[PDB]
Each structure stands twice: as C-alpha cells, then as structure tokens.
Design a protein around this ligand. Sequence first.
Ligand SMILES: Nc1ncnc2c1ncn2[C@@H]1O[C@H](COP(=O)(O)OP(=O)(O)OP(O)(O)=S)[C@@H](O)[C@H]1O
Ligand SMILES: [Mg+2]
Length: 408
Amino acid sequence: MNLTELKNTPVSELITLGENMGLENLARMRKQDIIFAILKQHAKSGEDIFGDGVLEILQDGFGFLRSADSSYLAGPDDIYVSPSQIRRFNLRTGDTISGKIRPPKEGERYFALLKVNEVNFDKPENNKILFENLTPLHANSRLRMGSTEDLTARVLDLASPIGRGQRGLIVAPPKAGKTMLLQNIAQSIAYNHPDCVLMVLLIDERPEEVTEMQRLVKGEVVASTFDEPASRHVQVAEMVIEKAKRLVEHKKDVIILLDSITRLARAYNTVVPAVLTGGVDANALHRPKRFFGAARNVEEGGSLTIIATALIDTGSKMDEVIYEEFKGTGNMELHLSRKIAEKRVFPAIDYNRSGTRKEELLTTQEELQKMWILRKIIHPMGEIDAMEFLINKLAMTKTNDDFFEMMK
Ligand SMILES: Nc1ncnc2c1ncn2[C@@H]1O[C@H](COP(=O)(O)OP(=O)(O)OP(O)(O)=S)[C@@H](O)[C@H]1O
Ligand SMILES: [Mg+2]
C-alpha cells in the first residue's frame, strides 16, 4: 500500500506501469503527464498514496509541491497545498513537505496534500530564519580540497581557499575551462564533505551540458534550458535559494554552485525594467544581488556558500556592466586567464590577480605563512609562464610537503 517506491525515474523506464496497467493509449503524453494518469488509477482502488515535493506559494496564497527532479517545473504531477494548510504549519516557499496525499475531486485539477509527515526533513515542531541570522565571518570552518584531477583542485587551496559559508566569484571569458572547474569543485566537495547539501544551479545552459552535469555531480542539479522563457530562468534560482536558506535555518551547511550571475541577471532584467544604462535596468540588478548576497556563515550554526561565475569578455555590452556591479560584492575571487586557455594549458587561473581576501582566519597561524612565500615570487613571474611553474613544483609532491622539501 504505497506509491513512493521511486518517483525520480527516467522517462522510458517510468512506463513500467504503462505496460502493466489498463491504460488505453499513451502515445503523446509527457513524463510529468503520465504520472498523473497513474496516480489517479492507483486512486480508483482506494489505497494509500504517499508523496513529497518542494513548496512554492503562488500570488494567490496557495502553493504546490514542485518536483526537484524536473527542476521545479510546473506540471500535472504536482501536489496542491491549500492556504489553510499553509497557516496550519507555518509554511514558506522553499519547504520540503512530505506525507500522504489525496486524489482530486470533481472540478479539481491537481492532487492535494492530505497529511504532513516531515517539514524540511523534520517533525512539524520547528526556528529562526536566514533573514535574521547573525552573520559575523566566513572563517571558523574550512572546506579543504595525487591524481591530475586533483590539479584543478590543488591550486585552489593555495590561490584562493573556499570557506564554509563564503561568497565566491569565478571570473571567466568564453572557452577558459569554466564548466569543468565547477565539475572539479563538485568532486572535491562530494569526495571530501558528503554532509553539506550540494546544489548545482545552471541558468540558460545547453541541454547536453545539464545532462553531463547531472551525471558527473552527486546531488541536486537544477537547471534552465535555452529554449525556456526568461521567467523560468528566475523561477529555478528563486526556488533553489529559497530552499537553501530553509536548510541553513536548521544549522546545516549548503553550497550553491551557480552558473553565470550574468545569465541569471539577464533574465532578471528582461522580467522588469524602468530608465536604462547601456541596455541594463539599474533597478533590476537588485533581485540577483539578493541571490548572491545571501551567501554567509551563520553565527548560530550552519552556512550558505555560493561560488558563482561571472562572465567577462562576452562581446555583449550588457555582460560587461553586470560583472562591474559584482566586483568585490563577494569575498573570494578566482580569475580565469584568456591566454592560458589559448595555448591548451589547463588549471588555467590567473594566480596573480586571483586572491581570496580575509585569508588569515581561514588557515592556521602558519598554514598561510608558507603560502605567502610563493605569493612573494609571482610579481617577476609572467602570465602563461606562471602556471607551468605551478605544476612541476607540485606534481612531485602532495599538499603540506609542497614547500617543506621544495626550498632547495
Ligand atoms: N580541469 C581541466 N582539465 C583538463 N582540461 C580542462 C579542464 N577544464 C577545462 N578543460 C578543457 O578546456 C576546454 C573548455 O571546455 P569546457 O569544460 O566546456 O569549459 P568552458 O570554458 O565553460 O566552455 P564554454 O565557454 O562554455 S563552450 C575543454 O575542451 C577541456 O578540454
Ligand atoms: Mg560552458
């Protein structure tokens, strides 16, 4: 007597019951559409129907349990929540409600929630929200990150360390090795810290890039495709960040690997304007600045760390304005050099103009002391002839032995 055995299933596989049930024809029905016909059939013979989703309260006071699998897309398989059920348990957008659901009545489109079991993976008896969580520093906890796959991660913990609940900005021009850098972060965080909920968000991304990201990354991978309207690029980011805070409310750590603040801001721009400077509404930047600005280490407990990408040298006059607005709004900067990518040289990062401010407190009292040694002999070093020196003086060693036996 259940139907939550597996909801997150592939399309061709989901037709398991489509080859077992007494269904007429299922030729032109979507994946989210076919679950609706199956759920109603398991309702025809009484039974109990369990279910879960992510809360999104609409303009009219009611909400729906949006499927995290479908990147919070609106579908028929969504579970409805009444305004009465919102007041009953103090529910806000971003909540992960789970429990028994009910079949629709006559004149009802959606399936509705019946019983509430877990809110935010916890009993309905819980407190303080992210908006009033005291935010002192990013340095009390650290996300430390001999294969060549650990070469696009080794430089990071020397060039620009990643703090727990830290605002990070990756700056990259087209074709600089940006997409796989995020895939290298995702590895050096899952294969190192499998406790903090990892969310990988991609705005206005290609269909082949999202599926590859969905494959290689362990965790929540929410993304919007290029064919989708400008409004949907917002909805996903609006839903990912609203769930993230809700988890930080439970003293839990959350890391968001957002792709392109620009591509997110370009969406936030085409969805409400008024007076322009170079094709960008100056008022529109307020909404995406709230997204990136939420990244913090909470004093009471938990963290929210957003390591997002900024696009420079796109060619567009709009994209040049966006990065300028975000220059130093974060406290962690990782530049990606154009010239190092032009001559096939990877872990391509501008070590020189890529620091990670407020460092002192993120490392031990002398963990930084042997890091400023190389940092003092980079000024006379070139650009493309600076990264080759960072491989040979690293490959023959490990992490802490990088200078103890490498000082002549
Ligand atoms: N860590 C890495 N190790 C080895 N090769 C890399 C690494 N990062 C990037 N590359 C190479 O650099 C190229 C960059 O392609 P992507 O991984 O898609 O990065 P990208 O700069 O985001 O590409 P665009 O601009 O979105 S088409 C690839 O062809 C890879 O071969
Ligand atoms: Mg890419």
